[PDB]
Design a protein around this ligand. Structure first.
Ligand SMILES: N[C@H]1CC[C@@H](CNc2nccc(Nc3ncc(C(F)(F)F)s3)n2)CC1
Length: 293
């Protein structure tokens, strides 16, 4: 009964009377996400509703709230408040008009300057997290929110881990299979660089529309990742050399030679980054492609 700690993180108050105009904007294993309007202040918010009985390891919910409230940053979605209502936890965040990077990678073609800009913002987030001793462990396009202002933010801290000088490596087989690093899949001690791998896979998503092996089942993908290591592109000759080089540093098998986020922020590939405004057309196009979907 560590549900003691959770009940005292949470604010008290009528959540269904503090906020109105609930429209579902998203869903996940994590839960359903709604937009809503604060009765007071008028401010529109994003609220995630998470069934508790679905999550057996309730330290992960606690850990999730704490990591968001203690590691605020422009490239991380902004925690406002939390509330327990019945057998359901509500997490309130700042709403940003925009979309997931998943809508853009599946519905559009990004150029290298657009890709370089997303990567840079993501690496900025990870360098911040990694220096504050936090591994995300679930990097993927579905967990990147793009703002109509041009913003790029990380979300979904439900799988994240805190490390220490003493316990500097983790050992949980955690993540989404197609984005998981080999050292995770093969049950070795792993550190912050598993996020770098995952970002590399997200770069493939932006190039090819999908992570490697997506047409395979999750379990098979796991086998493939462990046996193949560094995945191959469908059409590698389509990319510039600096881009290819960035990918090779992200998707290095040798953890020690794989880029940290600090290193990677200095790579040449990010120097072709367009301005963030260049992303808003992508967002516009994704909304149009999913008018029905
Ligand atoms: N998995 C990521 C976060 C959830 C999000 C739901 N879809 C969405 N669609 C339009 C706009 C929008 N704006 C948001 N602002 C803040 C938000 C969060 F809840 F994450 F804090 S979502 N979100 C999808 C991508």
């Amino acid at each position: 009964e560590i549900l003691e700690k959770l009940r005292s993180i949470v604010s008290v108050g009528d959540p269904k009377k503090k906020y109105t105009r609930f429209e579902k904007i998203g869903q996940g294993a994590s839960g359903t996400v709604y937009t809503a309007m604060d009765v007071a202040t008028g401010q529109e918010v994003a609220i995630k509703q998470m069934n508790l009985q679905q999550q057996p390891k309730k330290e992960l919910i606690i850990n999730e709230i704490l990591v968001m409230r203690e590691n605020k940053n422009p490239n991380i979605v902004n925690y406002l408040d939390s509330y327990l209502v019945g057998d359901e936890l509500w997490v309130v965040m700042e709403y940003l008009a925009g979309g997931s990077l998943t809508d853009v990678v599946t519905e559009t073609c990004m150029d290298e300057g657009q890709i370089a800009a997303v990567c840079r913002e993501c690496l900025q987030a990870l360098e911040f997290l990694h220096s504050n001793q936090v591994i995300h462990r679930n990097i993927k396009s579905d967990n990147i929110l793009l703002g109509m202002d041009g913003s790029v933010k990380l979300t979904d801290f439900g799988f994240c881990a805190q490390i220490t000088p003493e316990q500097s490596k983790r050992s949980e087989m955690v993540g989404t299979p197609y984005w998981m690093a080999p050292e995770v899949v093969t049950r070795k001690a792993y550190g912050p660089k598993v996020d770098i791998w995952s970002l590399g896979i997200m770069a493939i998503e932006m190039i090819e529309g999908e992570p490697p092996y997506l047409n395979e089942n999750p379990l098979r993908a796991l086998y493939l990742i462990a046996t193949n290591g560094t995945p191959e592109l469908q059409n590698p000759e389509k990319l510039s050399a600096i881009f290819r080089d960035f990918l090779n540093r992200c998707l290095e098998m040798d953890v020690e030679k794989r880029g940290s986020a600090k290193e990677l922020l200095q790579h040449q590939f990010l120097k072709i980054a367009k301005p963030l405004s260049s992303l808003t057309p992508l967002i516009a196009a994704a909304k149009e492609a999913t008018k029905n979907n």
